[PDB]
Design a protein around this ligand. Structure first.
Ligand SMILES: Nc1ncnc2c1ncn2[C@@H]1O[C@H](COP(=O)(O)OP(=O)(O)OC[C@H]2O[C@@H]([n+]3cccc(C(=O)O)c3)[C@H](O)[C@@H]2O)[C@@H](O)[C@H]1O
Ligand SMILES: [Mg+2]
Length: 255
């Protein structure tokens, strides 16, 4: 079935052990940094929501352990707040993560500048397209920071978003390493609970399904046929987002 094929492709599991997965992600980040010792920083955009808070906690834990283990005082986790103009949840998230450094970059000025240049050329953006533009400016900011701090950009992509391609191509989807990949939405909550994250930090119509529908599907459960079709429709439609640019050698789009 397509469901079984998708589940395999995304590495999703019906049930996971919170603590064990926490260590799998942390050990992953630690191992990567020890393999590429020129990397001195982990950069992650924080929004005060479930995904970035979970990833952020794991990143700081990885950095904390590597410091104690190697003695390298130069390693650091950089949390980046990227507000558009002018949110107490972000402060709470920060207090929970206890990041080594927090940088605040307001992307409004740049986004308005990009839109003005486009407008003068004859292109007016719809609010929808402006949203992706915002996501890409956030990507740009994080990569500039990584470039100046010898770091890599950590992504928050997970199975529940990868399956529907619910991310901006080269926007929040533009990252270097994704420690949450394989987990579904509710499983991400499990990890946060295990980390004692303040409940309110992890507690939109675009899709024709709910996150419970998506997580159930990813867990291999029997869902109403039309819900399965909707989910698979999104998956098939967004394969280009989960693969490198298309070349004359590719044939996946021909099926
Ligand atoms: N090992 C690793 N594993 C995972 N991620 C890694 C990584 N090393 C770096 N990264 C990530 O990638 C980033 C570095 O890559 P990138 O941002 O490309 O930076 P970089 O590789 O330095 O790209 C710039 C080079 O491309 C040339 N360029 C660019 C564009 C157009 C043209 C032209 O001729 O028209 C030439 C430019 O002249 C220069 O030689 C790092 O900051 C980090 O975010
Ligand atoms: Mg997310």
């Amino acid at each position: 079935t397509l469901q079984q094929q998708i589940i395999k492709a995304l590495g999703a599991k019906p049930q996971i052990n919170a603590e064990e997965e926490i260590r799998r992600s942390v050990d992953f980040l630690k191992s990567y940094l020890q393999t590429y010792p020129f990397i001195k920083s982990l950069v992650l955009g924080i929004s005060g929501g479930q995904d970035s808070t979970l990833a952020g906690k794991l990143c700081q834990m990885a950095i904390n352990e590597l410091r104690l283990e190697t003695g390298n005082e130069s390693l650091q986790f950089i949390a980046v707040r990227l507000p558009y103009g002018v949110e107490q949840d972000c402060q709470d998230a920060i207090a929970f993560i206890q990041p080594d450094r927090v940088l605040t970059v307001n992307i409004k000025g740049a986004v308005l500048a990009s839109e003005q240049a486009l407008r003068e050329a004859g292109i007016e953006l719809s609010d929808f397209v402006r949203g992706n533009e915002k996501a890409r400016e956030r990507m740009k900011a994080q990569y500039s920071i990584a470039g100046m701090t010898s770091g890599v950009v950590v992504g928050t992509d997970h199975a529940a978003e990868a399956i529907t391609g619910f991310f901006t191509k080269y926007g929040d989807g533009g990252t270097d390493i994704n420690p949450l990949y394989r987990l579904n939405k509710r499983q991400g909550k499990q990890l946060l609970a295990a980390l004692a994250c303040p409940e309110h930090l992890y507690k939109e119509v675009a899709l024709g399904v709910t996150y419970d529908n998506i997580d159930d599907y990813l867990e291999g459960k029997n869902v109403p046929q039309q819900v399965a079709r909707t989910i698979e429709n999104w998956y098939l439609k967004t394969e280009h987002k989960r693969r490198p640019p298309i070349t004359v050698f590719d044939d996946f789009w021909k099926k």
